[PDB]
């Protein structure tokens, strides 16, 4: 589906965690359902993520306005809303905007898609009201360093629109890539990348690291794309 910040549509993450692999395979069977036969005025695309440990699924959906994302949520709550609670064990649904994104230069732009083979990291964090706009003009600045990490494959930064939270969507080659990348030593790391991590701490409250592999994906009046076959098992 794409993610670029210059088109016009919000961005909201439905993350999930659960307990059992019931829990995944529940949860991702549901909302294919959702995708392949929902309706929905205003709705772009949606793609679902899966998490290695089969625990917890994530929706990527892709809203043209605010006013079609509450429509949907006006029917679907307290019909679909507590059997996910009940398949879950934390539900959180993040109203974002895309604000910043880059991607190495051997891809031509962001896509998400079941037919790529992406390590699908997404990590949120909390920020005081106060200083969203800081992070927010912090991280979402060029990096070409980060460019040249191997498994490197893009990033997206994401504005909550309440004010409250950051999301951090990236794509990396394979987990190994990505573990080293992420586990590498501050020696390692320039002088630039340093300073700016080194001051990014003092804004986040929390942070929440996760890793999935993209299994479905529908875009408005196309035909879906699947790696999931009929019972939520995938690949």
Not at 12 to 19: P, Q, S
Not at 108 to 116: F, H, K, L, Q
Not at 189 to 199: K, S
Request: with cysteine.
């Amino acid at each position: 589906p794409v993610i670029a910040a210059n088109d016009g549509c919000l961005t909201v993450f439905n993350m999930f965690t659960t307990d059992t692999i019931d829990g995944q395979r529940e949860l991702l069977k549901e909302m294919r359902d959702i995708i392949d036969n929902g309706n929905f005025t205003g709705w772009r695309s949606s793609t679902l993520h899966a998490g290695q440990d089969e625990h917890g699924t994530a929706n990527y959906i892709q809203w043209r306005s605010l006013a079609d994302l509450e429509a949907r949520y006006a029917g679907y709550k307290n019909n679909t809303v507590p059997l996910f609670k009940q398949i879950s064990t934390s539900v959180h649904l993040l109203k974002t905007e895309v604000v910043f994104s880059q991607h190495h230069p051997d891809l031509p732009r962001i896509e998400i898609s079941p037919e790529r083979d992406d390590y699908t990291v997404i990590i949120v964090m909390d920020v005081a009201a106060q200083d969203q706009a800081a992070l927010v003009q912090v991280l979402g600045r060029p990096d070409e360093w980060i460019k040249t990490v191997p498994g490197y494959l893009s990033h997206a930064l994401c504005r909550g629109i309440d004010g409250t939270f950051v999301v951090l969507y990236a794509q990396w080659e394979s987990k190994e890539r990505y573990d080293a990348f992420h586990t590498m030593p501050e020696s390692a790391r320039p002088q630039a990348v340093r300073e700016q991590r080194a001051f990014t701490d003092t804004l986040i409250t929390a942070r929440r690291s996760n890793t999935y592999r993209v299994v479905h994906t529908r875009s408005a009046g196309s035909p879906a794309v699947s790696i999931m076959n009929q019972e939520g098992t995938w690949q």
